[PDB]
Amino acid sequence: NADSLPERIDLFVSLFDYNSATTSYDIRSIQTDFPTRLLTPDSMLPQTSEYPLKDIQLLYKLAQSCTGKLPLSPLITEPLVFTRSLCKGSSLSPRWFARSGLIHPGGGTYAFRYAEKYPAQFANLLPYMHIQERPNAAEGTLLYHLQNMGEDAINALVSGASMFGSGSDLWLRKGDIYYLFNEETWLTNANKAGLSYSLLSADCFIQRGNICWDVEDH
């Protein structure tokens, strides 16, 4: 009966009332309000695949002592400008962050680090901070849903997947808009289409018992 599976999934998608959705988000509005750099969890980690570890260490020591060895590689120019500015105490306008690569080599953003030293500029620099650096958003808002997405849900959203689950919500793409439905509606329409489903924490290539296995990429 697994041969009719694609047809049943199409029937499943067609059962939803897209005008009675919980909320809906245009993909364009999501890309305007959140650069991909500010969604992906890897932006919160030290940028070990972009800078040598010794260069990241040399930046932290420079930010601590505000004197001494400057890092070498010419890809540290902008992070050096940022670090020297905090040490010299000179100001960086919100337009400087809008111009930057946003992500600091030690993980997180320039804006969040700058707002930790100058908390009066927090609100104006919020658009340049990672979602995981911003305060807990109000329930039902786009930021709230994004902050509560695991890496797999974020990756599915960034890649524009036709559908993905995130917690207690189903995200369904119709055209260039995502429609959210609660899991009760998800399960009801899966029942009617003759479907069962599972939410994955990775891809599934080999199943043993009730365990889906996958190689991790890194």
- Beta bridge partners, 42, equal none
Residue 136 vs 210, nearer CB to Mg ion:
210
15 touches its own copies (CB under 8 A): no
Q: Per CB under 8 A, does 202 bind its own copies?
A: yes
**Residue 128 binds which entry of Mg ion, its own copies, none, CB below 5-8 Å type-dependent:** none
Tokens representing residue 58 in the block: 């040399």
- Measuring CA to CA, which residue among 155, 157, 132 is closest to residue 143? 132
Q: Is 153 in the site for its own copies (CB under 8 A)?
A: yes
Residue 201 binds its own copies, judged by CB under 8 A: yes
Q: Which 3 state secondary structure label does DSSP give 171?
A: strand
Q: Residue 42 gets which letter from DSSP?
A: G
Would you state the structure tokens that stand for residue 57, as one six-digit string?
């260490």
Candidate residues 49, 95, 119, 216; the one interacting with its own copies per rule CB under 8 A: 216
CA distance 167 to 199: 9
Give the one residue of 203, 206, 207, 213 binding Mg ion; rule: CB under 5 A.
203
- CA distances 60 to 17, 86, 169, 170, Å, are 53, 12, 40, 42
Closest CA to 102 of 130, 131, 74, 122: 130
Binding segment for its own copies (CB under 8 A), chosen from 14-22, 72-80, 113-121, 148-156, is 148-156
Binding its own copies by CB under 8 A: which of 1, 14, 20, 67? 1
Only segment of 22-30, 87-95, 161-169, 175-183 that touches its own copies (CB under 8 A): 161-169
The two tokens of residue 76 are 């540290």
Provide the binding-site residues for Mg ion, judged by CB under 5 A.
Answer: 203, 214
Provide the binding-site residues for its own copies, judged by CB under 8 A.
Answer: 1-2, 4-6, 8-9, 152-153, 156, 161-165, 171, 194-217
